[PDB]
Amino acid sequence: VDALPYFDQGVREAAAALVEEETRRYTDIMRNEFERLAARQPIELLSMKRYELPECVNNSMAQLEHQAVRIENLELMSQHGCNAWKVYNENLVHMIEHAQKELQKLRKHIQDLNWQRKNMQLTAGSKLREMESNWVSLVSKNYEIERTIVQLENE
Amino acid sequence: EELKKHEDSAIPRRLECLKEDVQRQQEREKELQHRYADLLLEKETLKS
Amino acid sequence: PIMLLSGHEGEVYCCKFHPNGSTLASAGFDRLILLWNVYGDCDNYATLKGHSGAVMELHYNTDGSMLFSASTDKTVAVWDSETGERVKRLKGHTSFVNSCYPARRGPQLVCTGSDDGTVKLWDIRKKAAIQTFQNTYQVLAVTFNDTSDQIISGGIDNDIKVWDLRQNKLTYTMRGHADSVTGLSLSSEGSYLLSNAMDNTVRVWDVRPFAPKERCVKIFQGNVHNFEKNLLRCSWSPDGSKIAAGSADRFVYVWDTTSRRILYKLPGHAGSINEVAFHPDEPIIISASSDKRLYMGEI
Amino acid sequence: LICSISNEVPEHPCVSPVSNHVYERRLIEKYIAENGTDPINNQPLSEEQLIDIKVAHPIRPKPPSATSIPAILKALQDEWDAVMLHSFTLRQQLQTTRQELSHALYQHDAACRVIARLTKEVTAAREALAT
Amino acid sequence: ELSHALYQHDAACRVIARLTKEVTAAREALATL
């Protein structure tokens, strides 16, 4: 479990191979049916609205009413014009800045957690250095004791 | 977050093992200088 | 808090804790020994009396049951912390007995350094002397070795001396201090011993069955002397972590065993600090200074 | 500002009182009938428990080339293309996450065995220096 | 789960790198002694 990130400043390819060798050892309704069939077959369902070409007496009369609706649909747009567009453009700037404020709030608390970890790493890494240096000293002391004890035995 | 939970769990585990490793030798240095106190003592007896 | 204590009429030379860490003893020129409670408001309950000369060194036993106190008037005294009353007046010293040390965890036995030219060994029960190693001259500080079988002493000739209680000869003489040594204190390791000397340098030594034959280990800078030549005393921390020293510079010097760095030169005093006391339990510091009062610093 | 089910920008947003989260009414109404509980927190929730919210309404500028013709043909075609090729590609992403999960847990357990093997190795090598 | 694992994997991987070099130091030390 334990692996010190701050302290370990220093084999990855070697250890990866040894870990690799131990690994060598060890909901929708009808909608989903037609959607998966359309993607598998690679064919989009054809919409016939002969509206564009124009039986053609009807197709002709279709083009007129939609063209009149079109020319009325372009009148109410031009009346306002660019005022209705730039009013929505302002809303999009209020929406954008809110996201980047959260980017900062996350940025600060992310660096703040790492900041607390850093001190812990440096606290213990010293204590481990004390142990190991101390451990080395203890080993040396035991060797010296053994040499001295032997001398006493020799008398 | 979970990496902190994995670290802050095993930060004392990395600590408490090494404390024993210090203490195991620290226990020995007493018995080392116990015997080192002994082997100086009988040395004078052989010197006398 | 700072907690400065007062109620002493002249310099306080010696201040030390109960080895419990319960009660406080301080003493100096005023020829009596004041006691306080370390906790609460640092308040004063008792005052021991009797010593005609200046109380130059007070020393506890290792439980805290009887009190030893070296006086200028040629005498040491052991008293009952139970009562405060004299049990024994160690007389027979032919001059100023400055330093006293009760044997710890051995038979009850005392080594006293004096200005007569002898170190004296005494048993409390016999009213008689045990041994006495007349080297040549004044011995200014004395401490046992944790075997209660060597005795270390420091005087005017700068070569720290140690006698074997059984062969009674100069066992171990160590050298390297440029001027008179003024204080010895062996850490609770039973091994590392601390030496103040007014040549402005403090040293660390180690009495072992086997030592490198030249056991001058660690060296720190900072202590001062002047026209006063007051007696300067040192101590280890309960842990052997920090060395505390005083000096005639009004600065409490707190150093570390590890990095030998200057952890502190603390001001606050008015006159020379003669003795610093470490709490056997806490990070509590008590300064006895020649400004006729004490300080209770918390670190 | 969005719905917490489809990823819409709702036309009639409604908030649930057990878990403060805005959903589009049609999509939250459907969930309660399927299984009567809050989709996010899995807490008991009914249709009467919901609270409709009000806002200044949402406006979409219908494109300049907007007729019955492109809206029937080109726009509606692109919408069912974009629904089809995304969820298929999203099903492809879920399949690899489970495969890359298995390579993660195996390589993890492979490392556990190395540590356990080296924990016996190191301390006994240190012990041998002590001996 | 993928991210927490990969991070903790290479974290646990550094345990081995440390452990291997100490184990190695114990060998030449004892061998030469």
> Hey, which residues does C275 pair with through a beta bridge?
C288
CB C113 within 8 A of CB C126: no
CB C274 within 8 A of CB C231: yes
- In what helix (H) or strand (E) does residue D20 lie, and over which residues does it extend? none
Q: Is B22 on the interface with C (CB under 8 A)?
A: no
**CA C298 to each of CA A10, C1, C2, C255: distance values in angstroms, whole numbers, following the listed order:** 41, 7, 7, 15
φ and ψ at residue C83, rounded to 5 degrees: -115, -40
**CA C42 to each of CA A107, C35, C45, C128, C295: distance values in angstroms, whole numbers, following the listed order:** 51, 10, 10, 39, 10
> Hey, which residues does C23 pair with through a beta bridge?
C37
Q: Is A46 on the interface with E (CB under 8 A)?
A: no
User: Hey, of E1, E6, E16, E19, which one would you mutate to test binding to chain D, going by the most D CBs within 10 A of its CB?
Assistant: E19
Q: How far apart (Å, rounded) are the C-alpha atoms in residues C124 and C107?
A: 10
Tell me if residue C69 falls in helix, strand or coil: strand
Structure determination method: cryo-EM
Q: How far apart (Å, rounded) are the C-alpha atoms in residues C97 and C70?
A: 6
Strands (E), E1-33: none
Residue among C182, C179, C191, C152 nearest C275 (CA): C182
Contacting residues for C255 by C-beta, under 8 A, at least 6 apart: C202, C220, C222, C242, C243, C244, C245, C261, C262, C263, C264
Q: How far is D95 from chain E (nearest CA, A)?
A: 14
Tell me if residue B10 falls in helix, strand or coil: helix
Which CATH number is associated with domain C1-299?
Answer: 2.130.10.10
Q: How far apart (Å, rounded) are the C-alpha atoms in residues C131 and C133?
A: 7
Interface of C with B (CB under 8 A): 147, 191, 208-210
Domain borders along chain C are 1-299
Q: Is B36 on the interface with C (CB under 8 A)?
A: yes
Q: What is the residue-wise DSSP string for D98-121?
A: HHHHHHHHHHHHHHHHHHHHHHHH
Contacting residues for A101 by C-beta, under 8 A, at least 6 apart: none
CB C54 within 8 A of CB C70: no
- A3 vs E13: CB contact, 8 Å cut-off? yes
Q: How far is D103 from chain A (nearest CA, A)?
A: 9
CB C69 within 8 A of CB C108: no
- B28 vs D126: CB contact, 8 Å cut-off? no
CB C282 within 8 A of CB C299: no
Q: Is E19 on the interface with A (CB under 8 A)?
A: no
Q: Is D130 on the interface with B (CB under 8 A)?
A: yes
Q: How far is A108 from chain E (nearest CA, A)?
A: 20
Q: How far is D51 from chain A (nearest CA, A)?
A: 24
The overall longest dimension of chain B from CA atoms, in Å, is 71
> Hey, which residues does C144 pair with through a beta bridge?
C151
- D104 vs E12: CB contact, 8 Å cut-off? no
* Chains touching E, CB cut-off 8 Å, 3+ pairs: A, B, D
Task: Fill in the amino acid letter for D11.
Answer: E
Q: What is the residue-wise DSSP string for D38-99?
A: -TTT--B--TTT-EE---S-------SS--HHHHHTHHHHHHHHHHHHHHHHHHHHHHHHHH
Please tell me which of the candidates E2, E19, E23 has its beta carbon nearest to residue D104. E2
Q: How far apart (Å, rounded) are the C-alpha atoms in residues A22 and A73?
A: 70
Kindly list the residues from chain C whose CB atom is less than 8 angstroms away from the CB atom of residue A144. 210
Q: How far is B13 from chain A (nearest CA, A)?
A: 7
Resolution (A): 3.3
Report the sign of the C-alpha dihedral through residues D102, D104, D105, D107, in that order. Answer: positive
Kindly list the residues from chain A whose CB atom is less than 8 angstroms away from the CB atom of residue C210. 144, 148
